[PDB]
Amino acid sequence: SEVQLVESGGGLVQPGGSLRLSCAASGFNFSYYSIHWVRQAPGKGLEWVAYISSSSSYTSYADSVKGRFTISADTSKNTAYLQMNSLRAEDTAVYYCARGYQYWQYHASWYWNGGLDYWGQGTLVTVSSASTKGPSVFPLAPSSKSTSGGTAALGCLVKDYFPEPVTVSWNSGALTSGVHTFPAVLQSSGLYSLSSVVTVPSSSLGTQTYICNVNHKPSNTKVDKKVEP
Amino acid sequence: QLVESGGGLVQPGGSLRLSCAAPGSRRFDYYTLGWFRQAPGKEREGVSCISTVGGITNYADSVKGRFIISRDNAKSTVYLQMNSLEPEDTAVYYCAAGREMCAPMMLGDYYDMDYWGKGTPVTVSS
Amino acid sequence: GRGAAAAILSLGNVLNYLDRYTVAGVLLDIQQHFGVKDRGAGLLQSVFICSFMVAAPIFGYLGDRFNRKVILSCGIFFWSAVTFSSSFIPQQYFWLLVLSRGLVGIGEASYSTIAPTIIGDLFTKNTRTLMLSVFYFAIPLGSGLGYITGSSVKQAAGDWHWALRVSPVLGMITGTLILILVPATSWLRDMKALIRNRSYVFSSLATSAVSFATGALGMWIPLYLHRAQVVQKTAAKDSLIFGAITCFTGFLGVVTGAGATRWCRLKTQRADPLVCAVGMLGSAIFICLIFVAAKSSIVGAYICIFVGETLLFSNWAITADILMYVVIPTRRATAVALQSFTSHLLGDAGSPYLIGFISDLIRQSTKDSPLWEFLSLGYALMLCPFVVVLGGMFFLATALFFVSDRARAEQQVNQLA
Amino acid sequence: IQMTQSPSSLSASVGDRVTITCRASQSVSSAVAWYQQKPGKAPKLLIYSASSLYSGVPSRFSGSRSGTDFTLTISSLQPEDFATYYCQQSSSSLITFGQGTKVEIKRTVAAPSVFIFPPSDSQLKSGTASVVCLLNNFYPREAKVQWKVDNALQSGNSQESVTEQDSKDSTYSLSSTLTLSKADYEKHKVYACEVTHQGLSSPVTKSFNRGEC
Amino acid sequence: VQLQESGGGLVQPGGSLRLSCAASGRTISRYAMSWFRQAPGKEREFVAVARRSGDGAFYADSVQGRFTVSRDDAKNTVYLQMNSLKPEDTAVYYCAIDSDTFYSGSYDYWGQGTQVTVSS
Q: How was this structure determined?
A: cryo-EM
**DSSP for C374-393, written as a single string:** HHHHHHHTTHHHHHHHHHHH
Q: Comparing C-alpha atoms, which of B48, B50, B40, B56 is closest to residue B89?
A: B40
The reply to whether omega before A163 is within 30° of 0 (cis) is yes
Asked if D45 and D54 count as a contact pair (C-beta separation under 8 A), the reply is yes
What structural domains and CATH numbers belong to chain C?
1-185 (1.20.1250.20), 187-417 (1.20.1250.20)
D52:B41 CB<8 A: no
Distance of CA D16 to the CA centre of its chain: 22
Q: Comparing C-alpha atoms, which of E20, E33, E22 is closest to residue E79?
A: E20
D94 vs A48, A59, A108, D11, E14, CA distance in Å?
A: 8, 11, 11, 33, 63
Q: Comparing C-alpha atoms, which of A127, A136, A148 is closest to residue A201?
A: A148
> Which residues are CB-contacts of C268 (< 8 A; sequence separation ≥ 6)?
B27, B29
Q: Is there a common fold for D4-104 and D113-209? A: yes
- For an interface test with E, give the residue of D13, D198, D202, D204 to mutate (most E CBs within 10 A): D198
Distance of CA B86 to the CA centre of its chain: 17
Asked if B78 and B71 count as a contact pair (C-beta separation under 8 A), the reply is yes
C234 vs B126, C113, C223, C289, CA distance in Å?
A: 92, 45, 15, 21
Strand partners, B81: B17, B68
Q: Where do the structural domains in chain D lie, given as residue ranges?
A: 4-104, 113-209
Q: Comparing C-alpha atoms, which of A227, A93, A218, A110 is closest to residue A167?
A: A218
Instruction: Name the closest residue on chain C to residue B112, using Cα atoms.
Output: C126
Please tell me which of the candidates D43, D113, D161 has its beta carbon nearest to residue A148. Answer: D113
**Sheet containing B3-5: order of strands:** B3-5, B15-21, B77-83, B67-72
3-state secondary structure labels for all residues of chain D: CCCEEECCEEECCCCCCEEEEEECCCCCCCCEEEEEECCCCCCEEEEECCCEECCCCCCCEEEEEECCEEEEEECCCCCCCCCEEEEEEECCCCEEECCCEEEECCCCCECCEEEEECCCHHHHHHCEEEEEEEEEEEECCCCEEEEEECCCEECCCEEEEECCCCCCCCCEEEEEEEEEEHHHHHCCCEEEEEEECCCCCCCEEEEEECCCC
A113:D175 CB<8 A: no
CATH number of the domain located at residue range(s) B3-124 in this protein: 2.60.40.10
Question: Looking at chain B from residue 35 to 94, which residues have their Cβ under 8 Å from any Cβ of chain D?
Answer: 40-42, 87, 90
| Rounded distance between C-alpha atoms, residue C161 and residue C177, angstroms | 28
Determine if residue D74 is left, alpha or beta; phi over 0 gives left, psi from -120 to 50 gives alpha, anything else beta.
beta
What letter does residue A133 receive in the DSSP assignment?
B
Last residue of a domain, one of A74, A96, A127: A127
Q: Comparing C-alpha atoms, which of B49, B4, C44 is closest to residue A107?
A: B4
Give yes or no for B53 touching C (CB within 8 A): yes
Strand partners, D162: D174
Strand partners, A39: A47, A95
**Sheet containing D204-209: order of strands:** D153-154, D144-149, D190-196, D204-209
> Which residues are CB-contacts of A154 (< 8 A; sequence separation ≥ 6)?
A140, A141, A142, A146, A197, A198, A200, A210, A227
B87:D52 CB<8 A: yes
What letter does residue A89 receive in the DSSP assignment?
G
Q: In the A/B pair of chains, how many CB contacts fall below 8 A?
A: 24
Whether D contacts C, i.e. 3 or more CB pairs less than 8 A apart, is no
Question: Looking at chain D from residue 5 to 44, which residues have their Cβ under 8 Å from any Cβ of chain A?
Answer: 28-33, 42-44
Same domain for A52 and A35: yes
| Rounded distance between C-alpha atoms, residue C405 and residue B57, angstroms | 19
> Which residues are CB-contacts of C133 (< 8 A; sequence separation ≥ 6)?
none
The CATH number of D4-104, from 3.40.50.360, 3.40.50.300, 2.60.40.10, 3.40.50.9100, is 2.60.40.10
Last residue of a domain, one of A109, A127, A145: A127
Per CATH, the homologous superfamily of domain D113-209 is: Immunoglobulins (2.60.40.10)
Determine if residue A9 is left, alpha or beta; phi over 0 gives left, psi from -120 to 50 gives alpha, anything else beta.
left
- Nearest chain B CA: its distance from A107 CA (Å): 7
Instruction: Tell me the resolution in Å.
Output: 3.3
B25 vs B28, B75, C275, CA distance in Å?
A: 10, 10, 21
Q: Comparing C-alpha atoms, which of C394, C230, C247 is closest to residue C322?
A: C394
Asked if A82 and A50 count as a contact pair (C-beta separation under 8 A), the reply is yes
* Length of chain B (residues): 126
| Rounded distance between C-alpha atoms, residue D85 and residue D118, angstroms | 41
What CATH number should be reported for the domain holding residue A91? 2.60.40.10
Q: Kindly provide the residue ranges of all beta strands, DSSP E only, lying in chain A, ordered along the sequence.
A: 4-8, 11-12, 18-26, 35-40, 46-52, 59-61, 69-74, 79-85, 93-99, 123-126, 136-140, 147-148, 151-161, 167-170, 179-181, 185-186, 192-201, 211-216, 221-226
Q: Which domain holds residue A143?
A: 136-226
A71 vs A52, A59, A88, A201, C382, CA distance in Å?
A: 7, 8, 19, 60, 63
| Rounded distance between C-alpha atoms, residue D109 and residue E63, angstroms | 11
Query: Which positions in chain D touch E56 (Cβ < 8 Å)?
Result: 11, 106
Q: A132: buried, middle or exposed (CB in 10 Å: 19+, 13-18, 0-12)? A: exposed
- For an interface test with E, give the residue of D103, D108, D141, D174 to mutate (most E CBs within 10 A): D108
Asked if A151 and A38 count as a contact pair (C-beta separation under 8 A), the reply is no
Query: Which positions in chain C touch B111 (Cβ < 8 Å)?
Result: 125-126
| Rounded distance between C-alpha atoms, residue B7 and residue B5, angstroms | 7
| Rounded distance between C-alpha atoms, residue C220 and residue C23, angstroms | 11
Give yes or no for B19 touching D (CB within 8 A): no
E105:D109 CB<8 A: no
Whether D contacts A, i.e. 3 or more CB pairs less than 8 A apart, is yes
| Rounded distance between C-alpha atoms, residue C303 and residue D159, angstroms | 89
Please tell me which of the candidates B27, B29, B105 has its beta carbon nearest to residue C417. Answer: B105
Distance of CA C401 to the CA centre of its chain: 29
Q: B8: buried, middle or exposed (CB in 10 Å: 19+, 13-18, 0-12)? A: middle
Question: Roughly how many angstroms between the first and final C-alpha of chain B, as a whole number?
Answer: 35
D136:A146 CB<8 A: no
**Sheet containing A167-170: order of strands:** A167-170, A211-216, A221-226
Query: Which positions in chain D touch E52 (Cβ < 8 Å)?
Result: none
| Rounded distance between C-alpha atoms, residue D176 and residue E64, angstroms | 32
B27:C266 CB<8 A: yes
Give yes or no for B74 touching C (CB within 8 A): no
C308 vs A149, C271, C281, C313, E17, CA distance in Å?
A: 109, 22, 10, 9, 112
Q: Comparing C-alpha atoms, which of C247, C214, C222, C268 is closest to residue C22?
A: C222
Question: Looking at chain E from residue 64 to 83, which residues have their Cβ under 8 Å from any Cβ of chain D?
Answer: 64
What structural domains and CATH numbers belong to chain E?
2-118 (2.60.40.10)
Instruction: Name the closest residue on chain A to residue D132, using Cα atoms.
Output: A140
The reply to whether omega before D140 is within 30° of 0 (cis) is yes
D54:B87 CB<8 A: no
Same domain for A110 and A15: yes
Q: Where do the structural domains in chain B lie, given as residue ranges?
A: 3-124
| Rounded distance between C-alpha atoms, residue C178 and residue C184, angstroms | 10
D100:A45 CB<8 A: yes
Residue A208, amino acid: Q
Asked if C389 and C383 count as a contact pair (C-beta separation under 8 A), the reply is no
| Rounded distance between C-alpha atoms, residue D146 and residue E31, angstroms | 22
- By DSSP bridging, strand D101-104 and strand D9-11 are parallel
